Amino acid sequence: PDTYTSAGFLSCWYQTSLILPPETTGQVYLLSFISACPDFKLRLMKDTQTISQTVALTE
Amino acid sequence: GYSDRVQQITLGNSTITTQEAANAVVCYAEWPEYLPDVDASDVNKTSKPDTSVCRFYTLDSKTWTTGSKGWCWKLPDALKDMGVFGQNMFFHSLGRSGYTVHVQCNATKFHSGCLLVVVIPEHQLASHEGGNVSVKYTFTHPGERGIDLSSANEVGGPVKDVLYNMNGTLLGNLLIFPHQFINLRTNNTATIVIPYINSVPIDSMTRHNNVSLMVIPIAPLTVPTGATPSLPITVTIAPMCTEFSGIRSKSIVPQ
Amino acid sequence: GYSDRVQQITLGNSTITTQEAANAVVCYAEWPEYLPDVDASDVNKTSKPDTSVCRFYTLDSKTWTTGSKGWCWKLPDALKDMGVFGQNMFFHSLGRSGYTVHVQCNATKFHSGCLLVVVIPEHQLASHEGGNVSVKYTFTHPGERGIDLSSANEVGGPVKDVLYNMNGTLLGNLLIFPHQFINLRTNNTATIVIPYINSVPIDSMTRHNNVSLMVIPIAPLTVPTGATPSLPITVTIAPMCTEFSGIRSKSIVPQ
Amino acid sequence: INYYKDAASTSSAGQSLSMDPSKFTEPVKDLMLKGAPALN
Amino acid sequence: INYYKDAASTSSAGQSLSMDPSKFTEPVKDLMLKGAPALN
Amino acid sequence: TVASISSGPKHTQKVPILTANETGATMPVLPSDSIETRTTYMHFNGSETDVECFLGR
Amino acid sequence: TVASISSGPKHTQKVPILTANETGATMPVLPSDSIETRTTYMHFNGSETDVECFLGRAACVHVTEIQNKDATGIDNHREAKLFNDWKINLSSLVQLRKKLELFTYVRFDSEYTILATASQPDSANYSSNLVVQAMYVPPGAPNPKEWDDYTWQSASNPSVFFKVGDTSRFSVPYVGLASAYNCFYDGYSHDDAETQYGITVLSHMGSMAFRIVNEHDEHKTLVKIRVYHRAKHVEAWIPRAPRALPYTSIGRTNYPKNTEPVIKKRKGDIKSY
Amino acid sequence: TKDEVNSYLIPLNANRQNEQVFGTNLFIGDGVFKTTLLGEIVQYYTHWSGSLRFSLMYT
């Protein structure tokens, strides 16, 4: 997360509204995915904050 | 596997997809185009903001209920406040535009109801007072709110009687104007492309509206048993081929 | 009978005539041009309002008096409120522009005085506090008013010391930047054409100003005997080849 | 001979031998000829 | 120039410059065309 | 190499943005399928994401 | 190449020495426009004034220090200089800074040389050769907390190990996010009312972490790190006025208050020699 | 409050009009994005550029 370098926001709203058929009830869910377009570039490799350790593992 | 039924309209930085369309109407079989020189009069070069004005603005939603009489929006008024379209509008002396109108209303296979979506070129409204009472400015410039035909007569406002189209003609004959129906059982959207229609090559965008879009329930909404008795209707509209000319100080309009 | 001396610049719907010019400077010998694809990064089609934004805006006038220290305007800030240029500015995510700057000051053959008119690409100001005090936003975004180098230090504002260009360099060396003098005895206007200069192809128009225009009296104004001791200086500026991209909701900026 | 694969790893560049002060010394819009009057 | 006899002793390999995501992004049996309906 | 091609308004019966993810595919949708784009080039090869590079230090 | 051509008496209507400086030009006047000259050749190319040459020699950009000592009971390694760290930057020391800020945007590859020398302040015995490890910790990657964290594994982050007394040298491509590095930036990172002004916000290039790999001996050893930077493949745009007042901060243009007159006052008149 | 299959589900309510379904900033290296494969790889690099593809499947 850099400010200068920030990319925007993504939001989603009802355009009209969800309508369930009779005999049906409750919440429905959306699943959401993310992937990169063929457009994409990544550069300057470094270490991930996503993994660390405190002592060497053993068998 | 193309159906008349599924469609995508991409205009500017905005896209609409419908999976339950009923073709689309192009008024008088003509598609919006810019103003040719042979038809030009004002000597000013015009400004064509392109993608910053020719995108889709979704007006605030309406609620169709069993008592609804119908709603009416005027163009370019309805868009007088949308993004840069609106700014351009108040800032140039003259402007010209065509539009893509997409009216949306989805339900389920147990609902019934049918809306008429029609575009009327030069819809001069009538005063409910009769005689030669005029319809004040503000009343014919409702903005994005549009006019609600089931609202009460107001003073200086137009008549809101539906069997008479707000002008002394019968609802039944509105079908002579470019229009499309939304029949819950068939359809879920209506799309009409409006070419610029006027008796002058370019005009003022504030003193004269050149089309009213009208959505009118005709077969009443009927929801399945113990369903909520109402559906929202949404109108999204995109200026297309817009041109502005005679830039200056920025109009100040009543109210 | 063409002289270096008389000139006409017509841009959009506005024209300037000077009968006492001293040639014109084109920064770094390059004339403003649009953004080529080979240099492009953002995939968005850009908007080129053309004649509605590329016309001449005359900022409010200044008054040169014997005590004046000099004035400083930032671009695109100075124009943040001019007509549709400004609207476009607040409404798109990114924009890019070059300008024609025309500074005007006429007197008579008995007056003396000489102003330096200079354009500084990336003029990062200094805090008068020293150390690593920053210069708050509002202070570097004076708008059409510009900064008055003879006004008092304020808190969070920049230093206004002229022998140091507001940054730790000497007034005498400002001549390495595109500039032109207005010497009452010679000249009555200064005109500089500014091409877009940045390290990125397009940028934000609100978080970063890319040039400061500076008008600085160097040989003090000297009026004829019993003349009023002051002259007005007027600055008129026109965006040229402007492009906006990434349209949306409309930025909200401090103060 | 470069011993390394990447361009950053090569030695210093070699003289521009470009040299054109006119963008800095004569950025005027209408060309000035030395010897002709400055202001006509 | 390799100074050594065995292949393991050579430096890093050089860019595949192969790149074909379809085994991962589109392993479907009947080909899907973008723009045509997903399910017919 | 182009990173984006130029593309303008669309009003079609051919909708590349509606798909069925149940199929297991990730359909190759691009900016130009849903907004109007301008040409831009990649200027990049993806050199430093090669697995030889990733595991090679 | 001729440096001067031969030129003789003149009595013309064509006066190259009268100009109008108000125009902004510096007219290319030569000795031969106003005196009688003889031919002479240049004998010179201007080689050593090329910007590649001007910015191309190593300059000291940073001096830091770390120590090798028993970390037993140290609650804050960073604070004990058990491993210092440096917020990479190129304006902390001023000789090179004034040189770079003669330009607005600059683009180049960097060649770093790191010299590390040891000092034993407290009377000592045998010094066992210390090996320094210099890691590149770009922004977004775990930054070291103790002098022997998992971080130092540096499995994806370039690191160099060299001996104290020796020098390490490697070269990094131009890592800027834009097309050039901004030597100046009259902007903010966003339209915030209180955000910092300057390039500090554009300078982000992360930091570099040093530590000794050796465990501790009986005495303590001070190791002082000097980082040198040489620009190679230089490209510079838009010349600016040279820096006149002293510097006060990395990344702001600010000068100190009650500074002294920078122009030398005459000892005598305007008329004085 | 603890990782659950449920944080993959964006709920939808029948009959709401005009309202907002979800919101997020686009810091692909943090927040919602961070554990996704995209987020997870982006974190091995310092810089990214390119287009993202965000899709929603209705259930």
Ligand SMILES: Cc1cc(CCCCCCCOc2ccc(C3=N[C@@H](C)CO3)cc2)on1
């Ligand atoms: C081991 C090991 C250690 C390293 C360090 C990698 C180098 C990264 C530094 C990149 C260059 O840093 C800068 C910082 C600032 C500027 C700059 N600031 C402005 C005044 C001008 O230029 C230029 C380069 O790599 N491997």
